[PDB]
Every structure is written in structure tokens, then in C-alpha cells.
């Protein structure tokens, strides 16, 4: 199953560049922008410049109608770059001109083409003002009605989880953790055949046309290693929705040879309780003898 990560706008490409510098293998990146000046500094193995005649190589100057029309008009090259993909993550800063307008349509392209399409967008800092927060909003709703399932990140939460000293690029990286977690997690299920296996059909089942989504990976060792990992796993302070009310869950548990039944049940109960609802849970496990004292819980939860 081939996974493609698509940045749309400068935000999206920064997202991409950081994720490359982090090193993610067996995921194919695509950078997409109106701004040529940007794309020239992207590390993406594949780049697509859109709205060329609309903007002559400049960004969309905070009118999304431009990013929209731009992409809608470079559809065919986009499609060629997409093709061969089973799942696509569409990543974008909402509020700009390019992202807000083009991103909803990259994903609508991606959905019609048949891909399982996950939106991962940022809402902007309150300090960017009301007007941007509203353009951002319009984007997010287009993105919701355009994808299978959407992840939203109000940028303001960074200010809540950062200390007064943290460089800006660090805060943005911490926001990247969401995308990195989903991508690494799914990539990992797909690549490994478990004792109780999860595969891509399960991903399709919990993620197709489900609205809001949470994606986590939690890692821990110690006494309560399984409760602690499942608790790390299901908890971003960076999201718009919590886990509560979830209606679909896919959950994988990876451990060494001492992975107990009792504690697999314990992590699964962390989750099942946490939704506060009768869930459709699909459950899987992997015993990786390399792993010594630590376990990793991968959780993907939708249905809000
Ligand atoms: N969290 C995070 N947010 C970003 C980043 N880059 C931009 N943003 C936010 O996302 C929004 C849009 O990002 P940006 O890439 O500048 O828009 P654009 O679509 O490129 O807009 P334009 O070039 O046509 S004007 C901005 O309002 C900003 O708040 C980033 O690297 N990390």
C-alpha cells in the first residue's frame, strides 16, 4: 500500500521539509505551491507549481479563490503525481491564499481518484487576526466536506504547550508530530504482519467518511507501561477534538515476548473507556522480540 504526503501552501511544504529532515522512509512526498520562490527550497522529491498564469510564480496573496482556481486548473499534473496511491495525507496551513483554496481540491481530487484521504490542517494563531481566522474556518469546512477524515490543529495550542523560550521551528516541529505519528503508525502496520494482524482494509474501515479523527503513538516501559503507552497514545493537546465520543477505533499493541494479556486488556480499556461510547473497535498485536521492556500503542480513532 503506497502512502503519499502532500503539502499544500508554504505551511504544508514546511510540514513536508521537516518530515523529510526527520527521515521517514517508504513514504513518497509531494510539494505543491503557487509560490515558486518557496518550492525552489523544498526538499521534496516531486514538486508541482500551480496557478502559474494566475500569479506568475508568486503566492496567492491571501485570496483563496486564487489557490482554488489555480489547482483546479493544474488538476491533470496533480493527478499524475498522485496516481499509484492507496492513501493520501493532505497537509495544509489554513488561512493563507494557496492552502485554503487549493488544499480542499487536492483532496477532492484525491477522493475522486479513490484514495483514502486524510486532511491535516492548522488553524492560525489568534494573533493573526479575525479575518484570517475566518478564511481558515472556510478552508477547514471545505476540507471536511472534501476528505474522508480530517485532523485540525489550532496553532494557538503551541503557545499553550511551549515555554516562553522555545524557538519557533521547534514549536512547529511539535505540531508535525501529529502527521509523523499517523504516517509512521500506518506505515508500520502495513509493513509488519502481526500475531494479530492489522492491515490496510481495517484502516479503510475506521477512516472512510468518518469526519473527525485522532492519531497517536504512545511508548512506555515500567510497571504501567501499557496504561502509560495507551494514555500517551490517545492524547494530543494539539487537536481540536478529544477521543471522547469515538465510534471507530483501530488499536495495535507492540511489545516484546513478555507482553501480557492482562495489560493488552488494560490499554484496550484505557481506550474503550476513553471513547465513553460503544465503539467499533478493531484490535491487533505485534510481538517484536527485539523490544525488551517497552511497549508501543498505536491508536487511530474516528467517528465523531
Ligand atoms: N503550525 C504551522 N503553521 C503555519 C506554518 N506555516 C504557515 N502556517 C500557518 O498557516 C497559515 C497559512 O500558511 P501559508 O503557507 O503561509 O499560507 P499559503 O496558503 O501559502 O498562503 P499564500 O502563500 O497564497 S498567501 C498561516 O496563516 C499560518 O498561520 C507552519 O510551518 N507551521
UniProtKB/Swiss-Prot annotation:
<dbReference type="GO" id="GO:0005737">
    <property type="term" value="C:cytoplasm"/>
</dbReference>
<keyword id="KW-0131">Cell cycle</keyword>
<keyword id="KW-0132">Cell division</keyword>
<feature type="binding site">
    <location>
        <position position="132"/>
    </location>
    <ligand>
        <name>GTP</name>
    </ligand>
</feature>
<keyword id="KW-0963">Cytoplasm</keyword>
<feature type="binding site">
    <location>
        <position position="18"/>
    </location>
    <ligand>
        <name>GTP</name>
    </ligand>
</feature>
<dbReference type="GO" id="GO:0000917">
    <property type="term" value="P:division septum assembly"/>
</dbReference>
<dbReference type="GO" id="GO:0005525">
    <property type="term" value="F:GTP binding"/>
</dbReference>
<comment type="function">
    <text>Essential cell division protein that forms a contractile ring structure (Z ring) at the future cell division site. The regulation of the ring assembly controls the timing and the location of cell division. One of the functions of the FtsZ ring is to recruit other cell division proteins to the septum to produce a new cell wall between the dividing cells. Binds GTP and shows GTPase activity.</text>
</comment>
<keyword id="KW-0342">GTP-binding</keyword>
<keyword id="KW-0717">Septation</keyword>
<protein>
    <recommendedName>
        <fullName>Cell division protein FtsZ</fullName>
    </recommendedName>
</protein>
<dbReference type="GO" id="GO:0051258">
    <property type="term" value="P:protein polymerization"/>
</dbReference>
<feature type="binding site">
    <location>
        <begin position="97"/>
        <end position="99"/>
    </location>
    <ligand>
        <name>GTP</name>
    </ligand>
</feature>
<dbReference type="GO" id="GO:0003924">
    <property type="term" value="F:GTPase activity"/>
</dbReference>
<feature type="binding site">
    <location>
        <position position="128"/>
    </location>
    <ligand>
        <name>GTP</name>
    </ligand>
</feature>
<comment type="similarity">
    <text>Belongs to the FtsZ family.</text>
</comment>
<comment type="subunit">
    <text>Homodimer. Polymerizes to form a dynamic ring structure in a strictly GTP-dependent manner. Interacts directly with several other division proteins.</text>
</comment>
<feature type="binding site">
    <location>
        <begin position="60"/>
        <end position="62"/>
    </location>
    <ligand>
        <name>GTP</name>
    </ligand>
</feature>
<feature type="binding site">
    <location>
        <begin position="10"/>
        <end position="14"/>
    </location>
    <ligand>
        <name>GTP</name>
    </ligand>
</feature>
<feature type="binding site">
    <location>
        <position position="176"/>
    </location>
    <ligand>
        <name>GTP</name>
    </ligand>
</feature>
<dbReference type="GO" id="GO:0032153">
    <property type="term" value="C:cell division site"/>
</dbReference>
<keyword id="KW-0547">Nucleotide-binding</keyword>
<dbReference type="GO" id="GO:0043093">
    <property type="term" value="P:FtsZ-dependent cytokinesis"/>
</dbReference>
<feature type="binding site">
    <location>
        <position position="155"/>
    </location>
    <ligand>
        <name>GTP</name>
    </ligand>
</feature>
Amino acid at each position: 500500500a503506497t502512502l503519499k504526503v502532500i503539502g499544500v501552501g508554504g505551511g504544508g511544504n514546511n510540514a513536508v521539509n521537516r518530515m523529510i529532515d526527520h527521515g521517514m522512509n517508504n513514504v513518497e512526498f509531494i510539494a505543491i505551491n503557487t509560490d515558486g520562490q518557496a518550492l525552489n527550497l523544498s526538499k521534496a522529491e516531486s514538486k508541482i507549481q500551480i496557478g502559474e498564469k494566475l500569479t506568475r510564480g508568486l503566492g496567492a496573496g491571501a485570496n483563496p479563490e486564487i489557490g482554488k482556481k489555480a489547482a483546479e486548473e493544474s488538476r491533470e499534473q496533480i493527478e499524475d503525481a498522485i496516481q499509484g496511491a492507496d492513501m493520501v495525507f493532505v497537509t495544509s496551513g489554513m488561512g493563507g491564499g494557496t492552502g485554503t483554496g487549493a488544499a480542499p481540491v487536492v483532496a477532492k481530487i484525491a477522493k475522486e481518484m479513490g484514495a483514502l484521504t486524510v486532511g491535516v490542517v492548522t488553524r492560525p494563531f489568534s494573533f493573526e487576526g479575525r479575518k484570517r481566522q475566518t478564511q481558515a474556518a472556510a478552508g477547514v469546512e471545505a476540507m471536511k466536506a472534501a476528505v474522508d477524515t480530517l485532523i485540525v490543529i489550532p496553532n494557538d495550542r503551541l503557545l499553550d504547550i511551549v515555554d516562553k523560550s522555545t524557538p519557533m521551528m521547534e514549536a512547529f516541529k511539535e505540531a508535525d508530530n501529529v502527521l509523523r505519528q499517523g504516517v509512521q503508525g500506518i506505515s508500520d502496520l502495513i509493513a509488519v504482519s502481526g500475531e494479530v494482524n492489522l492491515d490496510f482494509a481495517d484502516v479503510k474501515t475506521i477512516m472512510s467518511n468518518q469526519g473527525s479523527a485522532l492519531m497517536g503513538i504512545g511508548v512506555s516501559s515500567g510497571e504501567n507501561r501499557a496504561v502509560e503507552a495507551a494514555k500517551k497514545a490517545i492524547s494530543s493537546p494539539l487537536l481540536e477534538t478529544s477521543i471522547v465520543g469515538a465510534q471507530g477505533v483501530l488499536m495495535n499493541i507492540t511489545g516484546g515476548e513478555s507482553l501480557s494479556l492482562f495489560e493488552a486488556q488494560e490499554a484496550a480499556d484505557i481506550v474503550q473507556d476513553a471513547a465513553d461510547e460503544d465503539v467499533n473497535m478493531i484490535f491487533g498485536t505485534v510481538i517484536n522480540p527485539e523490544l525488551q521492556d517497552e511497549i508501543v500503542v498505536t491508536v487511530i480513532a474516528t467517528g465523531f
